[PDB]
């Protein structure tokens, strides 16, 4: 009962969506943490070779709007179209109400989109899952995660992709709610270093972003990524 | 000579050998699962009743309408998968109100039955060349009851097959086989409405799966002055106790 | 056996060179009750046997008039019978209005066979399962067109279709030299037609409630007899 | 339709859509077999003949015409839990077995084992057997007996009555004098349908074997058939 | 037969829609009870991991208007969209007609939407069964309806859906007397709490409660811990 | 009277132009060629559903022979995905 | 292999050996139809078909096997009756449209090409089955007598003589022999007799059944290029000549 | 190898990556068993394809795979004639539409590109089969000079200085390669299309290996003025010239 | 002596092939006995004869009906052949069939080898049994005297592998391994008689008459069983004339 995405199995479960959930588990780990004063995104890029142009690739993270950023896992091709639709929707909301989109409303829209392609038989589920991060007057900093099934959930600290269980356990053990960005960064880097299959997780394997302090959204280039990685002394 | 899996069982577009169209057949099988519905016609009126089929006592037995009105003089009882029946009843009411609006006159029951069966016909091409509306026939069958000055009290059974018959007495739903057999045993042209409704209660008791009660069984009648009116709980309890007083012992 | 591998749909031929799906549609006529028609130079008559579901129910309409000069009988599928009868009535009215001209019997026959044929070429749509006898009289004399759901239409002096119709057809074959010459005596022609259908019965006898007769001619507009009217012809 | 759905292969046709005995299809050990319980108080010798029939043809025995009475249940079980039973009717000097054949709920193994138990029980008493059933691979109604076959080579019989005939012709207690009648049918087991002419001919014939008056028997049989029996189904109303 | 929506099973079922309804059993338990003048909806919130942000998106029970409440079990993603369409319909009705949506009308619309997504094989039916509840505009009679993926809907005095539903429904069948339904809000809330406690072994942190009252009043409680204790004292 | 004069004709220019082209082809090449071309067009439109990208199918451009042409209707091109599903399936 | 299981249960599918098997099965279906022949004359074409008189009921005059597509085109088909009649209707529509457009009779090559295109289209897509009728049609126009044959595959050719149906084998052999004996170009009067002879020689495969033959011909000299049936003395003379066996 | 699954019927990739459907569509190009040749001259282009009927009754006048598409463009096809005619008419319609749309006569390059792209749609759409034909467009381009372009059902698009197609392509192409190699030139370099036709016939005979008369082949020539297929008498004259040589 | 046991499968090709074999050698084959049809969907049909009109396989006139599953015998070849007309009730009982019917029969008549025939649907690429798809047939063999160590270890330990290599498949065969299909269950049960042979055919649904003819031709070409070539003329049983109904004598050609 998997050739078609429109049909339930006798156990009342969708095999096609469960396969998609399996797919993202193969992608590189993406981890997000919320601190008392800012959000931090980190992502280990699965694709790696000495010839790849790290200085400009930045395909593992994306920017949707000022003070909103997302890390992605799964197919980059599938990620790109949803990111584009999210950007269009956010800018359209800004044009209409002349206020920045509350990130929850954005996550609602994208979760509905991802559900929708699980609905029509000619459309397969999006093989991607996003970590949303942003700021809004409604709730301040908050992390949202959305799966191919089209659902979403709020979190203080979450990991996505390969070995997500180990990263989740490490976060659940070490996390505290009063942390600040400069320490959440250390926590995230430690978690990625202990979750990776690489020996040392050099700066090339790593893509990074953060939102902190009206609010400055900064995605680090590899030079400062190396500087920070040596700052935390991996 | 080898036993092989058939495939004519699947889909409404395939004829079986000897030219039988099964997916309409199984649709009429789904009718048998529905609640029992009974109707009896007589020159002085027509009465019909239904098993409410309350799955649990928590359900509101007063708010599951297996009997409904389509117009002042025209109502119907239904059985089967009520989802399709909702669309069927809505179409019937729309047709009746549109007819009254356009022609400023009461809708003839036969015309309404034809219109309803036309909607039921839409698993294929419509009666006027309309494209197919749905992938499957309705899993619903109903019997219409009403009065027309040119026809008198009459009772039409309508299948999902796009066919309808005028019936002196009819039964559908669970155990309706024995119900109709006993109706054929009992029915006669001289039945008065009192006897008609008491006989409906008798047959329901004979076919019903549990004790016959006013909270699970209800009746409807069509009369020229009354039109379509549903008997209340007190009326049905009166009729049931009259049943155990008259027919029993 | 192998038939089950190629009868699944209206499109696929079989290696024997047959098309089983429309063959089943043709066979569907055998389930319907017998209906008989016969021709005479001045009159053409239909005779049909109505079936009712049970003794509690009324009898079905086996004969439908389309205009004062023609009508038809049918057997087989009720839905297809309704569809074809309504389509033919609509087109007869269309011809009578747009052209102010009565629709010719042969013209109607071909106009309807073209509709019946198209459904056998396209997937999803099924062949019609209604065989019907179109009868009418016009400027070109009396006609009786047998129809089959597979587009086949032919003009016959008389015929029988439906269950156990071959007996009536045999009687008509044995009396063709006789009943044709009965032109000018509608009662005798109807009696011959009824005597034809009588051979098709194995269980029940003809009665005022099941039998039904229709006649049309130069001096007789298409008329339907039923109930006590047909007592004198039984 | 502008295109057939490419995904519709359709599925292969060598295997049948029968229910699985147990969910563990990968089981790698001797699968258990149904047990059959037969009422031993029946006292078979008091009956001169037996009739074995599938549920879809009950209407041939109208209670208003012959005093049918239930003697007892045949009960079966299969621990893996599956378990089913059906009544043994009786009338005159004749036994009647009705199976309630249904492929959706009942695996044909139950039917075959029930047939074996029934025939091995009837073996010693040597009653006359009139097995009446249906088939979906026969062009027209046939009559059959152990010394005369009226089936053309391509035609055959399946389902429960297949098991009954098998036990009667081969295996233990074979060689029992029996008369058989099979009407043509359509659709799968238990939910089958019958043509009008074939059903009427069956009524005309089945009465002669049972000895009931043909006219009144035929009237009662038609009454039961056309009164919304599952055998007739949509026919009266689907066809004019 | 189970391969598609458009084909009946030989016995009259439509196995695909039945499978969808079974999938409705996957989600967490939700229950609703009609009091004499108040309606209580309780929901078994999935045991929150300590990393979940409790202060955002906590409630499955959600509003469709000032006087209507919707609860559900099953596939959450489908439920959100069905709720969105219900809200759209409610406001469209308020626009085209002066009077707000009757609860019966809203549940009919939701049942139609669910049915319409079953009319063709191209779309998966929603694996959800909503429990629309509320009070009709300017009318004191409480109303409570249940919808199913097939589009079948019915009004209940009390009903349960979701995981381990049978245990709760049997408990309500025994303990709810239609001759004397719980009148005051406290009694109805206690009945709901007792009903859910037969399934939710976890403490009160898992049980959410929503109370809807006539005249367009909706409130969610955060004090049922007292109610849980009282039932503990009664236990 | 309140509309711009060019509005009514330009609104459906592409579809009426295609209809006229098919009429000419039927006149010259018989019924078969318009049947083939219209069936190509409908089988391409029917099977291509992708609500997010309003851009349109590439093969639609290929079949209209406008794979190397630009029009102002191309330069300057209830909206939820589910509304699109409803509209496309007509369900 | 003539079957090729697997790749044949759906239209518009190429088999591993290039064949699209559904068209092959459509060709197979053409076999069972009534035999028909068309003979090319120096100034016309002669059609003959062996209509089996299945039962006495059929009215002889109005039950005709040879369909007229237009005043100047005769047509006869063998195979599935519905497909044949539908194709004839399409051909008649094409003739009407072309005449209405240019106000002149459609020359046979253009009409044959149009019908070949129409038939070929149905073999292209999944949702439609190939036409299971082999057709013979021809007539006379500005460019003289033409005689074409189109198959279920949509392939067609010009033919000096064509044959179809169950009796195709012996009829084809006899027609080959006739054209071999008379390359000079038969006259319509001679072609009628020759066609009657050939079609009777095809009847030996179905001797037990009664039959009639309808002979129609269109010739530049005989009927001003109008397609007219053979009735009366000429047909009976054809009977007598062919009766010589 | 035999196709695995859904690829057995529709154009989707297999585990080995290849498209079994298109590969089978290639084999259908040999179904009719014809083989063709194309070569370029100084100012003209010539195509030769066999015309083995072979049936005696089939009229030779219409066994023609060389379709006239436009004044300056001709084409010859391999594979079943139904698909060939469909493709040829599509080419004619596209050529006329281009002439109207861009105002100047349609170049062979762009026309063959359009046909290749149209074939490309079928190469990736699920519900349409490739036409299963191999087309060779020949013309005298007003700026490229004589040119030959070949398209195949996979949708490829390659220019050729000389081409052979059909079952016997290998010997013919090897012979043409040998001739050009020993000549050290990319064209025959004859100042009249008659000489180029004679050369093409000579090398066809030296590869197919069979001496054949006027009935067995049809010759198409494209000049700067217009494209025309040679009649039977012209082919006879050319063969007589070859025999005299 | 040897036994050949067709298995229901895509296109029923083993069963059709056994029909071809039996009908094409009527002068040799004869009916011996019916096996216990307990586990089969029960079958009862009339006698069958080759279309040539030769003497029926059921030599003795006492026979009037054909059982669901019977063993034909060839005295000259010392060969047995089962003809299974219906599939088993469920794969759950695939084990019991071998345990209680086939093996008792083999031990009863001292069979030396059982040459099982099978058909494999192209869609069944599960566990990648299909390899070298260019080929369309496959022959596998197993010998107890050579594989004594293999059976010695197999009844003691299990590797829980989704594929197995017990059978030695010959080169240029479209498979080298067997994973989950019918052979895994039985092969274990004939292991838990000197040798076993397994013949497989890649196949598709349809009129598999000619495909079965070619399969039988290939099988005889291979030296699997010492049988004379029936190539002189294959004779279908009279029953097959009804494969497409009885007649097309209806007025649409």
Strands E207-213 vs E39-44: parallel, antiparallel or unpaired: antiparallel
Contacts of I174 in chain H (CB under 8 A): none
Q: G23 exposed, middle or buried (CB, 10 Å; 0-12, 13-18, 19+)?
A: buried
Spatial contact of F52 and F81, defined as CB atoms under 8 Å apart: yes
Beta bridge partners, H67, equal H75
Q: Which of G90, G93, G121 lies closest to F36 in CB terms?
A: G121
Contacts of F50 in chain A (CB under 8 A): 123
Residue D135 in tokens: 């088939």
In angstroms, rounded to a whole number, what is the distance separating the alpha carbons of residues G47 and G137? 8
Q: B27 exposed, middle or buried (CB, 10 Å; 0-12, 13-18, 19+)?
A: buried
Helix (H, G, I), strand (E, B) or coil at H165: strand
Q: Which of I123, I134, I136 lies closest to H5 in CB terms?
A: I123
Fold of the domain built from segment(s) D35-238: Rossmann fold (3.40.50)
In angstroms, rounded to a whole number, what is the distance separating the alpha carbons of residues D23 and B154? 53
Cβ within 8 Å, pair G16-H63: no
Tell me phi and psi for residue C6, to 5 degrees. -130, -5
Q: Where are the domains of chain A?
A: 15-232
Tally of CB atoms within 10 A around B129: 12
Please check whether residue D2 touches G, CB under 8 A.
yes
I13: which residues sit within 8 A by CB, 6+ positions away?
Answer: I119, I201, I203, I208, I211, I212, I215
Q: For D132, what's the count of Cα atoms within 13 Å in the CB-facing half-sphere?
A: 22
Contacts of I246 in chain C (CB under 8 A): none
Residues 193-232 of H with CB under 8 A from G: none
Distances (CA, A) of C36 to B59, C195, C229: 56, 10, 18
Residue I249 in tokens: 């004598």
Q: Which of E11, E120, E157 lies closest to B60 in CB terms?
A: E157
Residue H46 in tokens: 């010539």
Strands H227-229 vs H217-223: parallel, antiparallel or unpaired: antiparallel
CA-closest candidate to residue I16, choices I239, I231, I193? I239
I91: which residues sit within 8 A by CB, 6+ positions away?
Answer: D20, D25, I182, I185
Domain of residue G46, residue span:
21-244
Query: Smallest CA–CA separation between B59 and chain I, in Å?
Result: 42
CATH code of G72's domain: 3.60.20.10
Query: Smallest CA–CA separation between G208 and chain H, in Å?
Result: 30
Residues 110-129 of H with CB under 8 A from D: 126-127
Cβ within 8 Å, pair D240-C62: yes
H68: which residues sit within 8 A by CB, 6+ positions away?
Answer: H74, H227, H228, H229
Beta strands in C25-180 (DSSP E): 35-39, 43-49, 63-67, 70-76, 130-138, 141-147, 153-155, 158-161
Chains H and I touch (3+ CB pairs under 8 A): yes
Helix (H, G, I), strand (E, B) or coil at B96: helix
Residue B205 in tokens: 């008791």
Buried b (16+ CB within 10 A) or exposed e, A21-39: bebbbebbbbbbbbbeebb
DSSP code of residue I142? E
Catalytic residue among G1, G5, G34, G135: G34
Beta strands in chain E (DSSP E): 30-34, 39-44, 62-65, 68-70, 133-135, 142-147, 153-155, 158-161, 207-213, 217-220
CA angle C218, C221, C224 (to 5 degrees): 130
Candidates D4, D11, D13, partner chain G, best to mutate (most G CBs within 10 A): D4
Per CB distance under 8 Å, which residues of F are interface residues toward E?
A: 82, 85-86, 89, 91
Cβ within 8 Å, pair E120-F89: yes
Largest CA distance in chain C: 56
Q: For I166, what's the count of Cα atoms within 13 Å in the CB-facing half-sphere?
A: 32
In angstroms, rounded to a whole number, what is the distance separating the alpha carbons of residues C8 and C12? 8
Chain breaks in chain E (C to N over 2.5 A) after: none
Per CB distance under 8 Å, which residues of D are interface residues toward H?
A: 3, 6-7, 9
In angstroms, rounded to a whole number, what is the distance separating the alpha carbons of residues D230 and E10? 12
In angstroms, rounded to a whole number, what is the distance separating the alpha carbons of residues B226 and B238? 19
Residue D138 in tokens: 């026969």
Distances (CA, A) of D149 to D155, I53, I58, I63, I65: 11, 19, 15, 10, 7
Residue positions counted in chain B: 249
Candidates A8, A15, A135, A168, partner chain E, best to mutate (most E CBs within 10 A): A8
Candidates G19, G57, G122, partner chain C, best to mutate (most C CBs within 10 A): G57
Residue positions counted in chain C: 234
Q: Which of E81, E85, E120 lies closest to F91 in CB terms?
A: E120
Cβ within 8 Å, pair C90-B129: yes
Please check whether residue H58 touches G, CB under 8 A.
yes
Residue reference for tokens 């430690």: A190
In angstroms, rounded to a whole number, what is the distance separating the alpha carbons of residues I71 and I6? 11
Residue positions counted in chain H: 245
Query: Domain A15-232: what homologous superfamily?
Result: Aminohydrolase, N-terminal nucleophile (Ntn) domain (3.60.20.10)
Distances (CA, A) of A135 to A38, A212, B182, H108: 9, 9, 74, 61
Per the structure, how many domains does chain G have? Answer: 1
CA-closest candidate to residue I227, choices I57, I12, I22? I22
CA nearest to D1 within chain F: F43
Distances (CA, A) of H15 to H5, I62, I174: 10, 56, 16
Please check whether residue B17 touches C, CB under 8 A.
yes
DSSP code of residue C4? G
Query: Smallest CA–CA separation between E169 and chain D, in Å?
Result: 25
Residue A120 in tokens: 């029509």
Neighbours of chain I (3+ CB pairs under 8 A): B, C, D, G, H
Query: Smallest CA–CA separation between I96 and chain H, in Å?
Result: 33
First to last CA, chain I: 51
Contacts of B3 in chain I (CB under 8 A): 41, 43, 85-87
Residues 155-194 of D with CB under 8 A from I: 155-160, 162-163, 165-166, 169-171
CA-closest candidate to residue B17, choices D140, G129, C115, D234? D140
In angstroms, rounded to a whole number, what is the distance separating the alpha carbons of residues E94 and E79? 22
Gyration radius from chain E CA atoms: 18
The answer to whether residue G15 sits within a structural domain is: no
Beta bridge partners, B157, equal B143, B165
In angstroms, rounded to a whole number, what is the distance separating the alpha carbons of residues E221 and C125? 58
Neighbours of chain F (3+ CB pairs under 8 A): A, D, E, G, H
Determination technique for this PDB entry?
Answer: cryo-EM
In angstroms, rounded to a whole number, what is the distance separating the alpha carbons of residues B229 and B243? 21
Cβ within 8 Å, pair E10-B139: no
Q: Given in angstroms, what resolution was this structure solved at?
A: 3.6
Candidates A116, A128, A150, partner chain F, best to mutate (most F CBs within 10 A): A116
Cβ within 8 Å, pair H127-G159: no
Cβ within 8 Å, pair H6-D3: no
Q: HEC states along chain A?
A: CCCCCCCCCCCCCCHHHHHHHHHHCCCCCEEEEECCCEEEEEEECCCCCCCCCCCCCCCCEEEEECCEEEEEEECHHHHHHHHHHHHHHHHHHHHHHCCCCCHHHHHHHHHHHHHHHCCECCCCCCCEEEEEEECCCCCCCEEEEECCCCCEEEECEEEECCCHHHHHHHHHHHCCCCCCHHHHHHHHHHHHHHHCCCCCCCHHHEEEEEEECCCEEECCCHHHHHHHHHHCCC
Chains B and H touch (3+ CB pairs under 8 A): no
Please check whether residue I77 touches D, CB under 8 A.
no
Cis bond upstream, residue H173 (ω within 30):
no
In angstroms, rounded to a whole number, what is the distance separating the alpha carbons of residues C6 and C157? 37
Residue reference for tokens 């091995």: D120
Per the structure, how many domains does chain C have? Answer: 1
Beta bridge partners, B20, equal B16
Query: Smallest CA–CA separation between G121 and chain F, in Å?
Result: 7
Residue H160 in tokens: 């050729």
The answer to whether residue B6 sits within a structural domain is: no
CA angle B212, B213, B214 (to 5 degrees): 140
Please check whether residue D11 touches G, CB under 8 A.
no
Q: Reply yes or no on domain E15-234 having CATH 3.40.50.1100.
A: no
In angstroms, rounded to a whole number, what is the distance separating the alpha carbons of residues I69 and I141? 25
CA-closest candidate to residue A86, choices A78, H62, B82? A78
DSSP code of residue H50? E
In angstroms, rounded to a whole number, what is the distance separating the alpha carbons of residues G3 and C128? 29
I7: which residues sit within 8 A by CB, 6+ positions away?
Answer: I14, I84, I116, I117, I118, I119, I182
Residue H243 in tokens: 């025999």
CA angle I213, G3, G35 (to 5 degrees): 120
Distances (CA, A) of B124 to B14, B71, E6, I4: 12, 28, 13, 50
Helix (H, G, I), strand (E, B) or coil at D224: helix
Q: I196 exposed, middle or buried (CB, 10 Å; 0-12, 13-18, 19+)?
A: buried
Contacts of C16 in chain G (CB under 8 A): 28
In angstroms, rounded to a whole number, what is the distance separating the alpha carbons of residues C41 and C44? 8
Cβ within 8 Å, pair A10-E77: no
Residue reference for tokens 């297949």: D162
Gyration radius from chain D CA atoms: 19
B119: which residues sit within 8 A by CB, 6+ positions away?
Answer: B87, B88, B91
Residue D214 in tokens: 């043909």
G1 in catalytic set: no
CATH code of B115's domain: 3.60.20.10
């Amino acid at each position: 009962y998997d050739s078609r995405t429109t049909i339930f199995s006798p156990e009342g479960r969708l095999y096609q969506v469960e396969y998609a959930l399996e797919s993202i588990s193969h992608a590189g780990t993406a981890i997000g943490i919320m601190a008392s004063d800012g959000i931090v995104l980190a992502a280990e890029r699965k694709v790696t070779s000495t010839l790849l142009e790290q200085d400009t690739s930045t395909e593992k993270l994306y920017k949707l709007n000022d003070k909103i950023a997302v890390a992605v896992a799964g197919l980059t091709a599938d990620a790109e179209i949803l990111i584009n639709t999210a950007r269009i929707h956010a800018q359209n909301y800004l044009k209409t109400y002349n206020e920045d989109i509350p990130v929850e409303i954005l996550v609602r829209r994208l979760s509905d989109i991802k559900q929708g392609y699980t609905q029509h038989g000619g459309l397969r589920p999006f093989g991607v899952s996003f970590i949303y991060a942003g700021y809004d007057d409604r709730y301040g900093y908050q992390l949202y995660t959305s799966n191919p099934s089209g659902n979403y959930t709020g979190w203080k600290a979450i990991s996505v992709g390969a070995n997500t269980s180990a990263a989740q356990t490490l976060l659940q053990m070490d996390y505290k709610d009063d942390m600040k960005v400069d320490d959440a960064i250390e926590l995230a880097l430690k978690t990625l270093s202990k979750t990776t299959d690489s020996s040392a997780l050099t700066y090339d394997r790593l893509e990074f972003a953060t939102i902190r302090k009206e609010v400055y959204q900064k995605i680090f280039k590899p030079q400062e990524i190396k500087d920070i990685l040596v700052k935390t002394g991996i | 000579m080898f036993l092989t899996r058939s495939e004519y069982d699947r889909g409404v577009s395939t004829f079986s050998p000897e030219g039988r169209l099964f997916q309409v057949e199984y649709s009429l099988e789904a009718i048998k699962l529905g609640s029992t519905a009974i109707g009896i016609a007589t020159k002085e009126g027509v009465v019909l009743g239904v098993e409410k089929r309350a799955t649990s006592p928590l359900l509101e037995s007063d708010s599951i309408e297996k009997i409904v009105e389509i117009d002042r003089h025209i109502g119907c009882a239904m059985s089967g998968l009520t989802a399709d029946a909702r669309s069927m009843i809505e179409h019937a009411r729309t047709a009746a109100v549109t007819h009254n609006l356009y022609y400023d006159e009461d809708i003839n029951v036969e015309s309404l039955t034809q219109s309803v069966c036309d909607l039921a016909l839409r698993f294929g091409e419509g009666a006027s060349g309309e494209e197919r509306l749905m992938s499957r026939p309705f899993g619903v069958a109903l019997l219409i009851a009403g009065h027309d000055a040119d026809d008198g009290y009459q009772l039409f059974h309508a299948e999902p097959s796009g066919t309808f018959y005028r019936y002196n007495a009819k039964a559908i739903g669970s155990g309706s086989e024995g119900a109709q057999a006993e109706l054929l045993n009992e029915w006669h042209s001289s039945l008065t409405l009192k006897e008609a409704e008491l006989l409906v209660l008798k047959i329901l008791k004979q076919v019903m799966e549990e004790k016959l009660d006013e909270n699970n069984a209800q009746l409807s009648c069509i009369t020229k002055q009354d039109g379509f009116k549903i008997y209340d709980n007190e009326k049905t309890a009166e009729l049931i106790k009259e049943l155990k007083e008259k027919e029993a012992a | 056996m192998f038939r089950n591998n190629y009868d699944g749909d209206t499109v696929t031929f079989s290696p024997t060179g047959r098309l089983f799906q429309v063959e089943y549609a043709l066979e569907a006529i055998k389930q319907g009750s017998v209906t008989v028609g016969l021709r005479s130079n001045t009159h053409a008559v239909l005779v049909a046997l109505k079936r009712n579901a049970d003794e509690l129910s009324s009898y079905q309409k086996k004969i439908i008039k389309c205009d004062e000069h023609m009508g038809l009988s049918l057997a087989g599928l009720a839905p297809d019978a309704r569809v074809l009868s309504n389509y033919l009535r609509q087109q007869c009215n269309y011809s009578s209005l747009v052209f102010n001209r009565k629709l010719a019997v042969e013209r109607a026959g071909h106009l309807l066979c073209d509709k019946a044929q198209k459904n056998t070429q396209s997937y999803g749509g099924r062949p019609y399962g209604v065989g019907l006898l179109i009868i009418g009289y016009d400027k070109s004399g009396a006609h009786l067109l047998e129809f089959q759901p597979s587009g086949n239409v032919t003009e016959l002096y008389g015929t029988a279709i439906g269950a156990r119709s071959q007996g009536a057809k045999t009687y008509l074959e044995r009396t063709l030299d006789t009943f044709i010459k009965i032109d000018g005596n509608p009662d005798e022609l109807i009696k011959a037609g009824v005597e034809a259908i009588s051979q098709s019965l194995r269980d029940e006898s003809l009665t005022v409630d099941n039998l039904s007769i229709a006649i049309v001619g130069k001096d007789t507009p298409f008329t339907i007899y039923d109930g006590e009217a047909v007592a004198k012809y039984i | 339709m502008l295109f057939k759905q490419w995904n519709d292969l359709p599925e292969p046709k060598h295997l049948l859509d029968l229910p699985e005995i147990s969910k563990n299809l990968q089981s790698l050990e001797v699968c258990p077999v149904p047990k059959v319980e037969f009422p031993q108080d029946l006292d078979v010798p008091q009956y001169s003949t037996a009739v074995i029939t599938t549920k879809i043809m009950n209407p041939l025995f109208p209670k208003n015409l012959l005093q049918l009475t239930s003697i007892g249940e045949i009960k079966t079980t299969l621990t893996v839990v599956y378990g089913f039973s059906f009544p043994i009717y009786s009338f005159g000097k004749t036994l009647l077995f009705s199976m309630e054949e249904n492929f959706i709920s009942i695996s044909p193994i139950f039917g075959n084992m029930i047939s074996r138990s029934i025939i091995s029980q009837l073996a010693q008493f040597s009653p006359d057997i009139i097995v009446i059933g249906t088939s979906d691979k026969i062009a027209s109604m046939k009559v059959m007996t152990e010394n005369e076959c009226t089936l053309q080579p391509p035609e055959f019989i399946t389902g429960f009555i297949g098991s009954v005939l098998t036990q009667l012709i081969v295996g233990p207690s074979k060689g029992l004098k029996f008369k058989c009648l099979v009407a043509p049918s359509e659709g799968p087991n238990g939910f089958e349908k019958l043509s009008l002419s074939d059903m009427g001919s069956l009524v005309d014939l089945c009465g002669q074997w049972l000895g009931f008056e043909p006219s009144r028997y035929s009237e009662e049989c038609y009454r039961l058939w056309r009164c919304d029996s599952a055998a007739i189904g949509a026919q009266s109303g689907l066809y004019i | 037969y189970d391969r598609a929506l458009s084909i009946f099973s030989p016995d009259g079922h439509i196995f695909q829609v039945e499978y969808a309804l079974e999938a409705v059993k996957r989600g967490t338990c939700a229950v609703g009870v009609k009091g004499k003048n108040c309606v209580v909806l309780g929901c078994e919130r999935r045991s929150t991991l300590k990393l979940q942000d409790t202060r955002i998106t906590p409630s499955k029970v959600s509003k469709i208007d000032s006087h209507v409440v919707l609860s559900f079990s099953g596939l959450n993603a489908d439920s959100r969209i069905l709720i969105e369409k219900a809200r759209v319909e409610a406001q469209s009705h308020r626009l085209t007609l002066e009077d707000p949506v009757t609860v019966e009308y809203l549940t009919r619309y939701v049942a139609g939407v669910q049915q319409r997504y079953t009319q063709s094989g191209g779309v998966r039916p929603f694996g959800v069964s909503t429990l629309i509840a509320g009070f009709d505009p300017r009318d004191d009679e409480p109303k409570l309806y249940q919808t199913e993926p097939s589009g079948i809907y019915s009004s209940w005095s009390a009903q349960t859906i979701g995981r381990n539903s049978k245990t709760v429904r049997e408990f309500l069948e025994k303990n709810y007397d239609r001759k004397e339904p719980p009148a005051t809000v406290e009694e109805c809330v206690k009945l709901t709490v007792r009903s859910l406690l037969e399934v939710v072994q976890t403490g009160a942190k898992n049980i959410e409660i929503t109370v809807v009252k006539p005249d367009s009043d909706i409130v969610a409680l955060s004090s049922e811990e007292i109610n849980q204790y009282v039932t503990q004292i009664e236990q | 009277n309140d509309r711009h004069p060019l509005e009514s004709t330009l609104k459906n220019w592409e579809t009426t132009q295609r209809q006229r082209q098919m009429e000419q082809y039927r006149q010259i090449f018989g019924i078969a060629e318009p049947m083939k071309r219209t069936m190509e067009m409908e089988i391409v439109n029917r099977t291509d559903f992708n609500p997010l990208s309003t851009n349109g199918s590439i093969h639609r451009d290929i079949l209209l022979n406008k794979e190397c042409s630009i029009d102002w209707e191309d330069v300057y091109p209830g909206d939820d995905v589910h509304s699109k599903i409803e509209k496309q399936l007509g369900i | 292999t003539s079957i090729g299981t697997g790749y044949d249960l759906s239209n518009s599918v190429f088999s591993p050996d290039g064949r699209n098997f559904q068209v092959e099965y459509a060709v197979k279906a053409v076999e069972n139809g009534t035999t028909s022949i068309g003979i090319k004359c120096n100034d016309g074409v002669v059609f003959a078909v062996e209509k089996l008189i299945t039962s006495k009921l059929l009215v002889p005059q109005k039950n005709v096997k040879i369909q007229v597509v237009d005043r100047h085109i005769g047509c006869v088909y063998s195979g599935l009756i519905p497909d044949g009649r539908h194709l004839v209707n399409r051909g008649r529509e094409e003739a009407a449209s072309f005449k209405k457009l240019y106000k002149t009779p459609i020359p046979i090559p253009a009409f044959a090409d149009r019908l070949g295109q129409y038939v070929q289209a149905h073999t292209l897509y999944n949702s439609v089955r190939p036409f299971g009728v082999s057709t013979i049609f021809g007539g006379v126009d500005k460019n003289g007598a033409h005689l074409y044959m189109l198959e279920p595959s949509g392939s067609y050719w010009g033919y000096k003589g064509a044959a179809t149906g169950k009796g195709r084998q012996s009829a084809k052999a006899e027609l080959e022999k006739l054209v071999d004996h008379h390359p000079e170009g038969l006259s319509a009067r001679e072609a009628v007799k020759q066609a009657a002879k050939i079609i009777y020689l095809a009847h030996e495969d179905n001797k037990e059944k009664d039959f009639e033959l309808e002979i129609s011909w269109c010739s530049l000299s005989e009927t001003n290029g109008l397609h007219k049936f053979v009735k009366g003395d000429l047909l009976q003379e054809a009977i007598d000549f062919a009766q010589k066996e | 190898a035999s196709a695995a699954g859904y690829d057995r019927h529709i154009t989707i990739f297999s585990p080995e990556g290849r498209l079994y459907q298109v590969e089978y569509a290639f084999k259908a190009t040999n179904q009719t068993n014809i083989n063709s040749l194309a070569v370029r001259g100084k100012d003209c282009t010539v195509v030769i394809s066999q015309k083995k009927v072979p049936d005696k009754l089939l009229d030779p006048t219409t066994v023609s795979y060389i379709f006239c598409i436009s004044r300056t463009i001709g084409m010859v096809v391999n594979g079943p004639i139904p698909d060939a005619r469909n493709a040829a008419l599509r080419a004619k319609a596209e050529a006329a539409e281009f002439r109207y749309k861009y105002g100047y006569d349609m170049p062979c390059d762009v026309l063959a590109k359009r046909m290749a792209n149209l074939s490309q749609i079928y190469t990736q759409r699920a519900y349409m089969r490739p036409l299963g034909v191999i087309l060779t467009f020949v013309s005298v381009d007003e700026e490229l000079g004589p040119s030959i372009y070949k398209t195949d059902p996979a949708g490829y698009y390659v220019g050729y200085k000389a081409t052979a197609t059909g079952p016997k392509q290998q010997e013919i192409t090897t012979n043409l390669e040998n001739h050009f190699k020993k000549s050290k030139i990319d064209h025959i370099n004859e100042e009249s299309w008659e000489k180029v036709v004679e050369f093409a016939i000579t090398h066809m005979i030296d590869a197919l290996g069979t001496e054949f008369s006027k009935n067995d082949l049809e010759v198409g020539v494209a000049t700067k003025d217009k494209f025309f297929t040679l009649s039977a008498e012209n082919i006879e004259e050319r063969l007589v010239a070859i025999a005299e040589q | 002596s040897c036994l050949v046991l067709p298995l229901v499968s895509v296109g029923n090709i083993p069963q059709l092939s056994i029909d071809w074999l039996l009908n094409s050698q009527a002068n040799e084959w004869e009916y011996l006995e019916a096996l216990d049809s307990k586990y089969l969907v029960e079958f009862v049909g009339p006698l069958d004869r080759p279309e040539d009109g030769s003497d029926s396989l059921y030599k003795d006139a006492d026979m009037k009906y054909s059982s669901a599953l019977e063993v034909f015998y060839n005295k000259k070849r010392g060969l047995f052949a089962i003809q299974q007309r219906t599939p088993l009730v469920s794969v759950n009982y695939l084990n019991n069939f071998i345990v209680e019917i086939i093996l008792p029969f083999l031990s009863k008549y001292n069979i030396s080898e059982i040459c099982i025939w099978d058909s494999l649907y192209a869609m069944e690429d599960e566990n990648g049994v299909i390899v070298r798809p260019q080929e369309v047939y496959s022959l596998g063999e197993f010998y107890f005297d050579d594989e004594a160590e293999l059976l010695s270890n197999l009844h003691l330990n299990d590797q829980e592998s989704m594929v197995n290599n017990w059978l030695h498949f010959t080169p240029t065969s479209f498979q080298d391994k067997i994973s989950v299909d019918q052979p895994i269950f039985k092969i274990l049960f004939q292991i838990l008689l000197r040798s076993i042979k397994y013949c497989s055919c890649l196949a598709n649904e349809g009129d598999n008459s000619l495909d079965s003819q070619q399969f039988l031709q290939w099988i005889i070409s291979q030296k699997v069983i010492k049988n004379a070539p029936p190539i002189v003329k294959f004779v279908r049983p009279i029953s097959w004339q009804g494969a497409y109904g009885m007649a097309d004598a209806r007025d649409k050609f």
